[PDB]
Structures are given as C-alpha cells and as structure tokens.
Design a protein around this ligand. Structure first.
Ligand SMILES: CO[C@H]1/C=C/O[C@@]2(C)OC3=C(C2=O)C2C(O)=C(N4CCOCC4)C(=C(O)C2C(O)=C3C)NC(=O)/C(C)=C\C=C\[C@H](C)[C@H](O)[C@@H](C)[C@@H](O)[C@@H](C)[C@H](OC(=O)COC(=O)CC2=CN(C)C=CC2)[C@@H]1C
Ligand SMILES: CCCCCCCCCC[N+](C)(C)[O-]
Ligand SMILES: [Mg+2]
Ligand code: NA
Length: 707
C-alpha cells in the first residue's frame, strides 16, 4: 500500500538515461539512481537537490541555505566553474556564466543521476555524472489536483496538476501543471518568488507511435540569497570569540536577483515494425537572468584582501573582524536548441541477441553577457562585531544599508561584456548484446565541440574547435536469483573555456573510470540493493603556472576512488526504508600549488538513511510517520587544505494523514519539518572567504486535494 511503496520501488527498476534504451537497472553496467514522483510527493523536496538526498556519491547541499541553483558535486567532481551539468528529457539544459535554468520538482515525473563518465552518450561532460529530470506527461486516467502549502518564513504556495484525454480512445491527451510560490529566505532581507506553468500534449495515432509536446515557462522576480561568508564568524570564531548568526546577511538592502525561463519542444518515438524503432528528442529555450549583488569577500586579514586600501587603513588586529565586500551587476539572455535522433535496431546472431543503438546528437548555445564588477575597495566594510546574544536571540539579524549599483567608479569597478557561442555535434554507436545471462555493452561516440567567445569590451574573439572520441565497454552477469555482478570502463571529455599564457584556448580535460560492483534486483521481492567501487581519474586539469604568471597551465591530474552502496526495500506492509553510504577518496595527483590534497567541499565519508511507517489498523489508520537523517563528513574548505569544515547530521520528519477517510480519497494532509533539531552547521566552504550556513529548521503544512 501507499503510493511510494513497492509500486515505486519496481517502477524505479527501469530507466533509459544509462543506455539511451529502456533497460532494467541491473542490466546497466554503470552506477545509476532513480527517484519517483510518488517518492518525491512523500518527501516534498524544495528542489531536485533534496530529492536525491538518499543517494550515494552526491553532495547536494553544498551551497547550504541557497536554492538559486541545482548544483551537485558528484563523486567529488563538477563542471568547470561549477556550472550545472543538468539534463531534462535526455537533452542538456546548457547554461553559461550565471545563466543556468532550474526545474521545479512539482513538474517532474522522476529524477535520475548517473555517476562517472557518460560522454559515450551525451558528449562533453564533467567526469562525475549528470542529473536527468523527466517532465510530467499526460496520463491515461484523469487527474484533477490542487495543492496548498503554508510554512515558516512566510512560505506560501498554491499549485495545480490537471491531465485528461480529449477522445475516448486516448489519441488526444494533455496535462497542465502550475504553481505560485513566495517566501522569505533564511537570511534577513532576502525573498524568493516563483511562477511556473508546464503545458504538455500527447498524441497516440496508434499503439506504436507517440508524440508528446513538452513546454515550460517560469518567472522568478527574486531568486534569494547567494552570498559568501568568511570562515571567520562561521567555521571559526571571530576574534571576540563569537559568530555570525545563520540568518546573517552581508549584502545590500537593495540586492536583487531574477531568473526567466521559456522553453518548448517534444519527445517522439515510433515503432516501425519488429526490428526498427526510432525516437527523437528536441527542445528550444530562451532563458534570462539579472542581479544587483553585494557579496562578501572575507575578513580584512584574509590574503584575498592584501591590496585592499580600506582594509590596510585599520589597526592590524581589526583586520580580523571586518568584512570586505565586492559587487556585481549582471544581465544575460541565452537561447539553447537541441535535437537527438536515435535509431534502435533489434535483432540477433543465434543466441547472440542484439540491441544496436546509433544516433546523432546536436546542440548550440548562445549567451550574451553585459555585466559590471566591483573590485577592491568598491563597496563599504562591515564590522562583524554584531554576533551578541541579541542578533541570534532577538531578531537574528539586522538588514544592512542600501548601495548605489549605479555610477560605477572606473577606479574600483569595471565593465564585463561577453558573447559566448557553443556548438556540439556528436555521432554514437552502442550495442547491448545479451548472451543468456551475459549482457555486454560496448559503444562509442565522436564529438565536434566548437566554442567562440567575443569580448565586446576588448573587441577580441577567442575560438576553438575540438574533436574528441569516447567509448565505453562493460559486462553484467545477470544470474536469475537476483545477484547481478558487473564491471566496466568509461571515458569522458570536457572542453576548456579558459585562455592560456600564449593566448589560446586550453585543450579539453578528460575522464577515465574503472568500476566494478554487484546489483541485487530480485524480481520476487520489492527490494533493490547496490554496491560498487570505482577508480575515476580526470586529466589535463588546469593548475597554477610553475612560475606564478597570472595564467594557468594544463597537465593537472586528480583521482577519485571510492565505494558506494544504495539500498531501498519495503520491510513490511507499512514500513519502507531507503539509505546509502559513500566513501570518497579524492586526490590531487598533479598540481603546481597542490598535490596530495583533497579538493574542497568533498567529504570523505557520506551517509543517509530513511524509513516510513503507515497505519492500517485502529483510529490511526491512514497515518504515515516517516523520518530520516543525513550525515555529512568533514571536508576541506579550500584547495590549500588550510582548514576544515566539520561533519554534521541533519534529521527530517513528516506526518502524513490519508484524508481519504473523510470521503476525499486520493487527498491528504502532511506536515514536514526539516532539520528537526534545528542544528547550526556550515554546509561547506569553497575557499576561506566562501562559506555557507546550513539550513535552519523548517516547517511546512501541505494540503493536497484530488477531485
Ligand atoms: C574557473 O574559475 C571560476 C571558479 C568557480 O568557483 C567558485 C566557487 O570559486 C571561486 C569563485 C566561484 O564561483 C569566484 C567568483 O564567482 C567571483 N566572481 C565571479 C564573477 O561574479 C561575481 C563573483 C570572483 C572570485 O574571485 C572567485 C574565486 O576566487 C573562486 C575561488 N570575483 C572577483 O574576484 C571579482 C570581484 C571580479 C571578477 C570578475 C570577472 C567577471 C571574472 O574574473 C570572470 C571572467 C571569471 O574569472 C569567473 C566567473 C570564473 O568562471 C569561469 O571561468 C567560468 O564561469 C562560470 O562557470 C561562472 C559561474 C560560477 N558559479 C559559482 C556559478 C555559476 C556561474 C570563476 C572564478
Ligand atoms: C533530422 C534530425 C537531424 C538533425 C541534424 C541537425 C543538423 C545540425 C548541423 C550540424 N553541423 C554542426 C555539422 O552543421
Ligand atoms: Mg581537440
Ligand atoms: Na553489459
């Protein structure tokens, strides 16, 4: 019983993000996780970020209390600059600079994460993995849902989800999902707002043809907090021995952040006969973003402010409890088009059944940037001596003062105007030959990644075309009792947008991974358990120039090797459980400035476990009680490994009551509380001047009704 029970467990056994063909998870020679709509509806995650919380190999709350982006550090790696490596419907949501798009989980059918190299099917990519969200689609049966949310910090949400067939044979059906949300962010003076509508339409002329129109529109007046805090006053105590309170805000009173998303496309598939099927995926999007932001830049005594006049103008002991600040003014617009066409050839060679995949992937991205950035001494200073049992106890924090984002002094600030172009075209081939219990996957892909940046201010143009090749091979020995052992080799590549000492675009970095493991996907039991160990290596990483030159040099190499185990299974008819453990060994293997160091923000040990319980007996029938905990190990807060952010464990709880016992079947009411013990933690730090307070205990009531 209960939607998220074995019904989800099993549905989650299938996926395509691993092989670009509908394969059962144990037949995929690579690490992959799946979270369902029922699952997401139970936990009510703020973003896809949380939705993946009980998955191994993923730091998902790195930025802490911020929700602006959906950045994930998978297996200790991320894309250059920390740009999202997020996919939607098999097509990438390409972004640039501060222009990345996000998707509300209320518009998703499910989310999936694939670990390690994946270029063999998607082209240029961060060695570590990629997230792939699936848009909600028109349903077979009717759906009339309205949802109401009320929570802390003045969180108020209201949305709907409607799906129906236009004819009685289902050849014509739609779906319309929309939500309105507004709330105050953890940090004083920050707000969050969002309006999203997803129009979808399906067309099934017959039973071997499907064309579904997928669109999304989202408007966000205010994005929320995305600032930086010094390790001094967060991880470590201030000279006065106190700390900045979790709701502290160091930006202007007039800081502003907005994102605009518009996209249309479709998912198509046609089964010609018994040996041929073809599917194409296309999407076009125009997204915009803007901000007027004052961010922190460490305390005056931080090396980063060695050249700060305002900073030196203070007594040597004050430099340690004064915060330096810089700013930015950004305006961006980008259009992104994508099409992936694939032909599936099903056949065999006597006991050698084949599944030949061959297709072409294409994409182009254009992002126009017009920003302005304040450097040293471009904005005031803040005397962090404001912890006190006042701003902690009483109104945790006092908003700061305004700030002139106009009249940009040529002395302390400057303009930034860039136009980036990106184009990628790849062709791939992959066969899945199963020889009765001996499934073997082997494929390849050739990519054409071409980039071109125009510096409107310098009147300069940097360009580079790359030509790469990646292949993957693996074998799964599917037993018949459940236990499915596997292993595989995999490659990945990622072009560089950086320019070197010579004035050229660095060569692409590459991903090399060896992984072995076993998967338990028994068919007679609603349970699934996995475990794997891997050795993933990225090469030609950009490192400091051997002789300090302001420019970087390639050659750097990093290695990440670890163990991941995931487990999901129904223990009774009312008790479900989910959990995983992650052991990550990330290390600098070749770097001028570092070496033997572990990159920042990546803990060595990671773990999480969750379980729920529903009643089908007494007056407490239909009552669901669930709870879980997420543990984050210690991590370094900078490449230099000069200090360390400590480990933490947050607990979440929910009480759901199946309102069906009042006649309203399919409707229910829930209460969710995050960080129950309202712990206080520093999520992570990317450096000494870039740390983030974790999320402070939240409480949300959710009334969802089905007609
Ligand atoms: C490869 O280096 C990347 C590391 C990422 O990771 C993080 C977590 O680590 C750092 C930062 C990160 O975000 C920094 C950061 O953000 C700073 N500002 C950037 C601009 O806006 C305000 C904040 C920042 C730093 O000093 C930062 C810093 O020291 C560290 C270690 N500003 C300044 O000193 C000031 C006062 C002005 C600079 C102006 C120009 C415009 C920039 O020089 C630009 C040409 C380019 O150099 C960067 C954008 C570069 O980006 C790319 O090359 C690809 O672009 C992206 O992917 C950008 C992007 C970053 N994030 C986190 C999210 C989305 C997009 C970053 C440095
Ligand atoms: C009909 C589906 C195939 C779409 C092919 C898209 C063509 C993109 C142009 C390729 N190239 C970059 C080499 O000019
Ligand atoms: Mg090349
Ligand atoms: Na295989």
């Amino acid at each position: 019983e209960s939607a998220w029970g074995p019904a989800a467990t099993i549905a989650a056994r299938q996926s395509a993000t691993g092989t670009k063909t509908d394969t059962p998870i144990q037949k995929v020679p690579q690490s992959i996780s799946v979270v369902t709509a029922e699952e997401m509806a139970l936990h009510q995650p703020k973003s896809v970020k949380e939705a993946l919380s009980y998955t191994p190999g993923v730091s998902v709350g790195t930025r802490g209390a911020s929700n602006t982006y959906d950045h994930l550090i998978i297996r200790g790696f991320a894309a250059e600059g920390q740009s999202q490596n997020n996919y939607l419907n098999g097509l990438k949501l390409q972004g640039n600079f501060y222009n990345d798009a996000v998707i509300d989980p209320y518009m998703l059918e499910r989310a999936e994460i694939m670990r390690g190299p994946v270029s063999v099917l998607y082209g240029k990519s961060s060695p570590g993995g990629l997230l792939n969200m699936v848009s909600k689609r028109p349903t077979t049966e009717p759906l009339k849902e309205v949802q109401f949310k009320a929570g802390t910090d003045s969180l108020f949400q209201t949305g709907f989800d409607f799906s129906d067939s236009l004819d009685d044979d289902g050849v014509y059906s739609y779906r319309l999902t929309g939500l309105a949300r507004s709330a105050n962010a953890q940090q004083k003076g920050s707000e969050e707002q969002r309006y999203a509508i997803a129009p979808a339409f399906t067309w099934r002329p017959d039973d071997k043809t499907n064309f579904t129109f997928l669109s999304y529109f989202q408007n966000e007046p205010e994005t929320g907090y995305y600032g930086w805090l010094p390790k001094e006053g967060t991880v470590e105590p201030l000279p006065n021995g106190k700390r900045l309170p979790t709701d502290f805000n160091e930006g202007a009173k007039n800081n502003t952040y907005s994102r605009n998303e518009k996209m249309v496309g479709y998912s198509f598939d046609h089964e010609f006969n018994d040996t041929f099927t073809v599917r194409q995926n296309l999407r076009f999007a125009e997204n915009k973003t803007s901000q007027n932001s004052v961010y922190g830049y460490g305390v005056c005594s931080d090396p980063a402010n060695a050249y700060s006049k305002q900073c030196a103008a203070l007594a040597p002991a004050d430099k340690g409890h004064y915060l330096a600040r810089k700013y930015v003014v950004d305006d961006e617009k980008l259009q992104n088009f994508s099409v992936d066409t694939q032909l599936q050839s099903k056949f065999a060679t006597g006991d050698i059944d084949h599944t030949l995949l061959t297709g072409v992937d294409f994409m182009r991205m254009r992002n126009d940037i017009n920003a302005w950035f304040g450097y040293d001494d471009s904005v005031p200073l803040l005397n962090l001596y404001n912890p006190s049992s006042h701003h902690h106890h009483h109104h945790g924090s006092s908003v700061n003062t305004d700030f002139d984002f106009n009249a940009k002094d040529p002395a302390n600030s400057g303009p930034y105007r860039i136009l980036n172009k990106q184009k990628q075209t790849g062709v791939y081939v992959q066969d899945q030959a199963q020889w009765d219990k001996v499934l073997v996957t082997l494929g390849g892909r050739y990519d054409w990644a071409d980039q071109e940046s125009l510096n409107r201010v310098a009147g300069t143009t940097d360009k580079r075309d790359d030509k790469q090749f990646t292949w993957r091979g693996g074998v799964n020995y599917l037993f018949d009792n459940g236990v499915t052992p596997y292993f595989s080799y995999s490659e990945s590549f990622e072009p560089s947008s950086q320019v070197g000492k010579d004035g050229n675009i660095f060569a692409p970095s590459k991903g090399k991974q060896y992984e072995v493991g076993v998967k338990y996907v028994p068919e007679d039991r609603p349970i699934v358990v996995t475990g794997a160990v891997y050795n993933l290596t990225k090469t030609n990483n950009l490192m400091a120039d051997p002789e300090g030159s302001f420019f970087s040099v390639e050659g750097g190499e990093i290695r990440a090797r670890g163990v991941e185990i995931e487990a999901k299974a129904a223990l009774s008819a009312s008790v479900n459980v989910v959990g995983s453990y992650t052991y990550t060994d990330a290390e600098y293997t070749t770097d001028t400035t570092y070496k033997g160091n572990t990159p920042a923000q990546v803990p060595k040990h990671m773990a999480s476990l969750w379980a729920d319980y529903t009643f089908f007996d007494g007056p407490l029938s239909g009552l669901t009680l669930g709870t879980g905990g997420r543990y984050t190990g210690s991590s370094y807060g900078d490449p230099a490994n000069s200090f360390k952010v400590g480990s933490y464990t947050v607990v979440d709880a929910l009480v759901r009551y199946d309102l069906a016992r009042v006649g309203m079947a399919g409707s229910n009411v829930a209460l969710h509380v995050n960080n129950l013990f309202d712990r206080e933690y520093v999520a992570s730090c990317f450096n000494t001047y870039g740390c983030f307070w974790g999320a402070e205990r939240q409480v949300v009531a959710t009334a969802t009704f089905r007609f």
